[PDB]
Design a binder for this molecule. Structure first.
Ligand SMILES: [Zn+2]
Ligand SMILES: [Zn+2]
Ligand SMILES: [Zn+2]
Ligand SMILES: [Zn+2]
Lengths: 100, 1189, 130
RNA sequence: CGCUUCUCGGCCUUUUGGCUAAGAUCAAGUGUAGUAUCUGUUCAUCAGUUUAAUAUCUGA
RNA sequence: GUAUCAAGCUUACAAGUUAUGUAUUUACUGACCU
């Protein structure tokens, strides 16, 4: 996301797998992280949607509730037609809070 | 400021064409892409003609178009890849007549990029996988399956990434229930770019690579990669499995290649050239088409080269291994980009420029007389197998599909003294070129003529029975002459026939089976075979006014109005009703219509009155002689018509200035009258029959036919003069037609072309028609014709003499001098057999003065071999008298790649006397090509290229007066308005130049900020300047309000001028606009900018009146961007902001797709806009009625 | 006045405003005020703080489409081969973002590069006319 | 002309009063990523490294 | 504590100097986070 710069996206080819969002991150965009104007469904690869990784949120990796969306600001900038925006790594956020 | 886009005649040049069973039936249909337009065509086999059923705007460029058949399926599906990263699969539904978007899938970013796929496409013929491919680095594979709702399913895109690798053409290999293979030409270039020695880029030859899709393992692997000692361009699928030797054919320069892996060797066949044709200094020869065909016994390929020579490629193998390949010369056609050979003997060739053609296969196989050779026979010294071209033997000309592409230059002019203006369009490339005059009417063709004297008022049409076609009699009456002519041969006045009554006749009709009802002063006739007349019609005195005709029921009136019926009995003779209204008169006209079912009265009465009123009444025996619904009209109707045109009863009154269009319905009458205009004599609205349905001809100062072409209400005029009357016609001389004369003659008319709008009439040409000008006195045209790689006919005769010389010189002791003289005296038509090509660097050009009425070679001035014309303008100088002058810019040794010119010339011509010939005056030299001539203040301005020069006449040569050198790279066009000079750069933009009167200086004072690659221009106002580019944009630049002209002349502002102009609109079309002109297309309308594109499309930009219309159409297009998305997946706002962003322009072509959807979306958009869909459709068509055709 | 202000927080918030505005008025004919504000956004490229550089990078990729890629490319020019590396790599990555955002729109927007002694740098295809 | 006294003005503490038990009591926050700014602080001639140009090292 | 709007009660009467490095705070940003 844009909030934590150490997070990297997956950026592989997108299939027909519809992305999901958890109850904590419902309505959030993936790139710009906004709440308004949904336009495009989120398509992720088959490696990030397989086995125990199905029905899973994109950002936090929790259980998905609603469908994931792109904003119109990401649509007219065409940040939806790039690689699959699945956040893989988790660093310096929600990790050291587990140890504290 | 605020403009509105509307197309009139859409795109006609075909880039891709496919054939298949798209409707789901046994017959086959064509799907073509016009680049921007997607069309479906049906080759009707019984008549041979072509009827377009659906044409849609995908709002993008169609870079890949290919159909596939599903495994175990009947209907063929369409795969479209475009500039966007949305691959779409389409299915044609014949019920709702729309391309159903089956699946739209994302595979990458948009735009015509190098990285993202869309450029080339391949599919497995069984219908299991499809590969979309770019030029470089990625090829994506979709797996096609079907699930239990008989529904298509598509999995994830498989990857075939290969960095630093070009892709030349991709094709699918037909395998029988095997892992599908895709063949493509690849080339590695990293050793070509890392090595500066240059020779590493010469031995980097092509590699054919096979990609095998393991459906069991779900990946793409490089299976085979075999090199090529030649360079190929595209490939051809060979059908296999249980059909034959499954493989790919490789077309290459002077060669055709078979490869198939494992054990079959590389079978090579050199391509046959012509005997001694004068186009081969060192050139090669490639293909342009494949045209595979499987006739269920064997399979062949109707390949096409770049000259139009069709080659019959047929594989014959004894074993499963290939033995040898062979081909032969089939036919000659104009050069086509794609073919679609069809079942039951049809071949549709889609030319890259000019008209398209449909031929019928008359003699397939053709293995009887032609001396054909093969590949594996030991032939040496090149190809060694030649052929002589021949006229048509295997194909016959059936359909000539009209196409205005390429529109290279266009003018709106009134040279033919018509009320409406005409379009003068340059078209074609090379020998197939034509100047085409375009009108607004329809193709009315004459078949016969007669010499009926006096002053006839009307002509009525009647048959023997309802089922026949001969239409036994045709009657013509004015006051007292009967004159009921025979319809067939030997048209002449008649004696007392079986249907004739008396002389003063006034109407005829067929009421019964063979019973004719005819009306005259002693009115009632009822004649079938016995003259059973009952001519009472006596309420004392009045007997002659106001007949009206239906086929089952009768209304006639007297001085009065609502009066007697005089029906017939179903098994007997006539009867009458005694219920009369007696109607204090006020009568002008009556006209009705009837429905084909009905054992009742089953019609609707329409009467018009002298006062500002009409009256429509249903006269059923319940509610009889009681008025139903009322009226309103301004002045007087003087005409009526009732019509049913659909597959709602369309009430049409018409008045002496305009016509209306109601929507009358049978229990209740909701009219909803559409309005339109037409000396302005009183109109006549008459019912005729075309195509199987009926239509209305409303006639005025000119005629106007209103027909329903799939519920679109086309009200298009006719091309002739005023004809004062209309009536139907049917015979064996012409099946359907309209006899329509009340003025001193008689003709037989026919309406052949009905679906289109414009009237193409073509005048043939020799070379490419670059541009032309208009002579205002004694209207003629002066055109320049210029082709690169072409000879002039004197050099052609010298080259043919040289050919004859070496044919009689090379070993003539053993002799055939008949061959040389036979090549000399036989001049082939270059428009059919293809024009000869003059190597590299030759520039053929002529100048043609033409009468645009008849279209004859009124004057022709030839040039030499390396001399090309690029600019021409007529003018009248100030130092001399009234005599005209023609300035022609000619270039010599221009050679294009790389550009290094060797100086040019400017020719001056006198144009004596009235413009019928053209005499040479003088020839001045110049250092660079003068591609721009402009008359200004009695002199000429010429853009040499970085140099703008003002010239004056001299008796020896032209003399300059000024010179400017601060202008940029190269001049592309100069247009003047008075006190200002608009200079078009070939690269950046417009430049404003001021010419001084006291001095002679050319001082620049204003420029623009955007590079545009400007091609053509037009002047709208004193400040606003419009322009277009090579890419497809339309821009309008408007100056700031101050912009002081008085600038007397070192720092600039940003490397140029200082008064930077602003842009009020940028717009994208997708096609190169080559002629912009501000004019008014109809008398009584208003001004609108007419742009004519490159691929045959013609559009207009329309100004808005007030801000509420701009706001309403902006909301219409904003709602249709969300409710009705385009077909290729390209976003409409992103396509109209393709290069430059859109600014204050509403695409009305998206707005006119409101009438093509279901009424659910129409109801949603109309209730969001607080209107009704008829009101929205009327507000939409007000702009096309007022400002357009 | 926000982009004229001395603090960088005002300028990064104003770059966010101009970004969301450019994503708001896209296709409406309001390119003059955006070209006015980008003349103040563009000297703020030189900042090295991550938040302000991602804010102005979002502003540049938002103004890439509204006023056109032509004005963005003209702003990138005479800054590609600049000898200071600190401006050089940042202008090259801005050119990379414009290249990946809209490649084909830049095709009509390229300037002319004349020929050297050996190679051919002229696009001869767009140079000739009919 | 100088000196003492008085009156008027230009003005440099004015805080809401004083007293009872100073009248009696009160005032919690993190953890992550990054940036700006104060205090403290200190700044002999060739050759190449490096740098837009500058500013560390080896040399006599 | 106030400025208007009746009944309660009251006489029913008199009457023509930029800058570096670091020890080190103060603030600021990312809709950062159970
Ligand atoms: Zn989440
Ligand atoms: Zn977003
Ligand atoms: Zn992924
Ligand atoms: Zn040291």
């Amino acid at each position: 996301a844009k909030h934590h710069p150490d997070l990297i996206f997956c950026r592989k080819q997108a299939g027909v797998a519809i992305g999901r969002l958890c109850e904590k991150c419902d309505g959030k965009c993936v790139i710009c992280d906004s709440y308004v104007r949904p336009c495009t469904l989120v398509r992720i690869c088959d490696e990030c949607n397989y086995g125990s990784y199905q029905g899973r949120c994109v950002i936090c990796g929790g259980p998905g509730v609603s469908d994931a969306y792109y904003c119109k600001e990401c649509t007219i900038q065409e940040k939806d037609r790039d690689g699959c925006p699945k956040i893989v790594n988790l660093g310096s956020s929600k990790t050291d809070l587990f140890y504290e | 400021m605020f403009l509105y886009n509307l197309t009139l005649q859409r795109a006609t040049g075909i880039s891709f064409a496919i054939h298949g069973n798209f409707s789901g039936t046994k017959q086959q249909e064509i799907v073509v892409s016009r680049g921007k337009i997607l069309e479906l065509l049906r080759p009707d086999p019984n008549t041979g003609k072509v009827h377009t059923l659906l044409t849609v705007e995908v709002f993008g460029v169609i870079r890949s178009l290919m159909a596939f058949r599903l495994t175990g399926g009947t209907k063929d599906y369409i795969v479209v890849g475009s500039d966007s990263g949305r691959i779409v699969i389409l299915e044609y539904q014949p019920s709702k007549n729309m391309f159903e978007k089956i699946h739209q899938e994302t595979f990458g970013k948009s735009g015509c990029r190098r990285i993202v796929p869309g450029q080339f496409l391949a599919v497995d013929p069984k219908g299991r996988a499809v590969m979309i491919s770019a030029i470089e680095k990625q090829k994506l594979v979709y797996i096609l399956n079907r699930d239990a709702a008989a529904r298509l399913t598509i999995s994830s895109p498989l990857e075939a990434h290969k960095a630093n690798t070009l892709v030349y053409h991709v094709v699918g290999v037909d395998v029988g229930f095997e892992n599908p293979m895709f063949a493509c030409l690849e080339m590695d270039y990293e050793e070509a770019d890392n090595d500066p020695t240059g020779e590493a880029a010469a031995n980097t030859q092509q590699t054919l690579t096979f990609y095998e899709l393991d459906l069991g393992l779900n990946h793409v692997v490089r299976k085979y990669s075999e090199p090529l000692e030649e360079h190929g361009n595209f490939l051809i699928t060979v059908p296999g499995g249980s059909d034959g030797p499954s493989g790919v054919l490789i077309c290459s320069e002077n060669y055709i290649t078979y490869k198939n892996f494992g054990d079959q060797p590389d079978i090579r066949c050199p391509i046959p050239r012509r005997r001694n044709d004068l186009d081969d200094p060192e050139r090669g020869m490639i293909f342009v088409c494949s045209a595979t065909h499987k006739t269920k016994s064997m399979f062949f390929f109707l390949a096409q080269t770049e000259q139009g020579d069709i080659f019959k490629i047929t594989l014959e193998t004894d074993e499963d291994m290939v033995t040898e390949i062979r081909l032969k010369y089939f036919d000659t056609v104009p050069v086509a980009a794609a073919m679609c050979v069809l079942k039951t003997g049809f071949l549709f060739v889609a030319s890259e420029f000019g008209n398209h053609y449909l031929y019928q296969i008359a003699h397939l196989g053709d293995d009887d007389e032609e001396p054909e050779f093969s590949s594996a026979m030991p032939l040496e010294e090149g190809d060694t197998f030649f052929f002589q071209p021949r006229p048509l033997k295997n194909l016959v000309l059936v359909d000539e599909l009209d196409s205005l592409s390429p529109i290279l230059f266009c003018q709106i002019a009134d040279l033919a003294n018509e009320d409406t203006p005409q379009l003068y369009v340059a078209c074609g490339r090379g020998p197939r070129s034509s100047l085409r005059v375009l009108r607004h009417g329809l193709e009315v063709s004459e078949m016969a003529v007669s010499e009926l004297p006096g002053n006839p008022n009307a002509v009525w049409t009647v048959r023997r029975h309802i089922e026949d076609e001969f239409d036994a009699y045709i009657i013509v009456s004015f006051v007292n002459a009967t004159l009921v002519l025979s319809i067939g041969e030997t048209v002449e006045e008649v004696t007392d026939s079986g249907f004739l009554g008396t002389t003063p006749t006034l109407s005829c009709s067929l009421l019964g089976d063979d019973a004719l009802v005819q009306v005259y002063p002693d009115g009632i006739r009822h004649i079938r075979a016995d003259k059973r007349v009952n001519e009472w019609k006596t309420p004392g005195k009045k007997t002659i006014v106001k007949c009206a005709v239906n086929q089952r029921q009768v209304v006639i009136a007297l001085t009065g109005g609502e009066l007697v019926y005089f029906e017939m009995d179903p098994s007997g003779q006539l009867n009458e009703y005694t219920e009369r209204k007696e109607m204090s008169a006020d009568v002008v006209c009556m006209s009705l219509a009837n429905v084909p079912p009905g054992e009742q009265r089953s019609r609707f009465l329409a009467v018009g009155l002298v006062d500002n009123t009409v009256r429509i009444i249903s006269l059923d025996p319940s509610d009889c002689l009681q008025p139903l619904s009322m009226q309103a009209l301004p002045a007087q109707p003087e005409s009526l018509c009732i019509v049913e045109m659909g597959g709602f009863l369309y009430l049409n009154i018409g008045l002496q200035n305009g016509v209306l269009l109601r929507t009358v319905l049978d229990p209740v009458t909701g009219d909803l009258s559409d309005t339109r205009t037409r000396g302005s004599r009183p109109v006549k609205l008459f019912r005729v029959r075309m195509q199987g349905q009926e239509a209305v001809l409303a006639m005025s100062s000119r005629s106007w036919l209103s027909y329903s072409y799939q519920s679109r209400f086309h009200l298009t005029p006719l091309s002739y003069e005023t004809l004062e009357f209309a009536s139907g016609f049917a015979s064996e001389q012409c099946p359907e037609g309209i006899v329509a004369i009340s003025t001193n003659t008689l003709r037989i008319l026919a309406l052949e072309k009905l679906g289109a709008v414009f009237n193409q009439v073509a005048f043939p040409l020799q070379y490419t028609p670059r541009k032309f000008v208009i002579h205002p006195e004694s209207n003629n045209l002066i055109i320049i014709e210029t082709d690169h790689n072409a000879y002039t006919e004197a050099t052609k005769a010298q080259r043919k003499q040289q050919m004859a010389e070496e044919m009689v010189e090379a070993a003539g002791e053993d002799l055939a001098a008949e061959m040389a003289a036979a090549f000399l005296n036989e001049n082939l038509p270059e428009s059919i057999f293809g024009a000869p090509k003059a190597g590299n660097g030759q520039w053929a050009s002529v100048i043609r003065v033409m009468n645009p009425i008849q279209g004859n070679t009124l004057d022709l001035v030839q040039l030499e071999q390396n001399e090309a014309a690029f600019s021409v303008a007529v003018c009248r100088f100030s130092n001399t008298g009234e005599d005209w002058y023609v300035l022609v810019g000619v270039a010599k040794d221009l050679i294009l790649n790389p550009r290094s010119v060797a100086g040019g010339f400017v020719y001056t011509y006198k144009l004596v006397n009235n413009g019928e010939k053209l005499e040479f005056l003088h020839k001045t030299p110049v250092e660079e090509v003068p591609a721009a001539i402009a008359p200004f203040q009695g002199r000429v301005l010429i853009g040499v290229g970085k140099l703008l020069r003002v010239y004056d006449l001299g008796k020896k040569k032209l003399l300059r007066k000024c010179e400017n050198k601060h202008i940029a790279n190269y001049i592309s066009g100069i247009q003047t308005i008075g006190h200002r000079v608009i200079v078009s750069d070939v690269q950046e933009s417009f430049i404003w130049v001021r010419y001084k009167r006291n001095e002679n200086q050319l001082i620049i004072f204003a420029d623009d900020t955007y590079p545009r690659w400007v091609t053509t221009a037009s002047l709208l106002d004193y400040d606003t300047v419009a322009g277009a580019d090579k890419f497809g944009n339309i821009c309008v630049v408007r100056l700031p309000p101050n912009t002081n002209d008085e600038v007397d002349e070192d720092r600039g502002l940003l490397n140029g001028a200082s008064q930077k102009a602003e842009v009020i609109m940028n717009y994208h079309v997708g096609e190169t606009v080559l002629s912009l002109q501000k004019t008014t297309l109809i008398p009584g309308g208003s001004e609108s900018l007419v742009y004519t594109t490159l691929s045959g499309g013609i559009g207009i930009l329309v100004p808005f009146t007030s801000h509420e219309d701009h706001d309403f159409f902006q909301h219409v297009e904003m709602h249709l961007r969300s409710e009705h998305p385009p077909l290729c997946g390209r976003d409409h706002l992103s396509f109209r902001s393709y290069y430059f962003p859109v600014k204050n322009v509403i695409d009305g072509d998206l707005c006119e797709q409101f009438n093509s959807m279901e009424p659910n979306k129409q109801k949603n958009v109309s209730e969001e806009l607080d209107r009704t869909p008829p009101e929205v459709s009327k507000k939409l068509e007000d702009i096309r009625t007022r400002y357009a055709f | 006045d926000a982009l004229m202000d001395r603090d960088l927080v005002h300028r990064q918030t104003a770059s966010a405003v101009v970004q969301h505005m450019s994503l708001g008025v896209y296709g409406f004919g309001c390119e003059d005020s955006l070209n006015h504000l980008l003349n103040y956004v563009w000297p703020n490229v030189f900042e090295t703080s991550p938040h302000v550089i991602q804010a102005v990078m979002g502003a540049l990729e938002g103004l890439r489409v509204a006023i056109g890629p032509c004005r963005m490319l003209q702003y990138c020019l005479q800054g590609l081969f600049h000898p200071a590396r600190k401006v050089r790599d940042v202008y090259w990555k801005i050119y990379n973002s414009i290249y990946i955002g809209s490649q084909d729109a830049l095709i009509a927007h390229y300037p002319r590069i004349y020929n050297d002694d050996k190679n051919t740098y002229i696009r001869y295809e767009l140079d000739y006319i009919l």
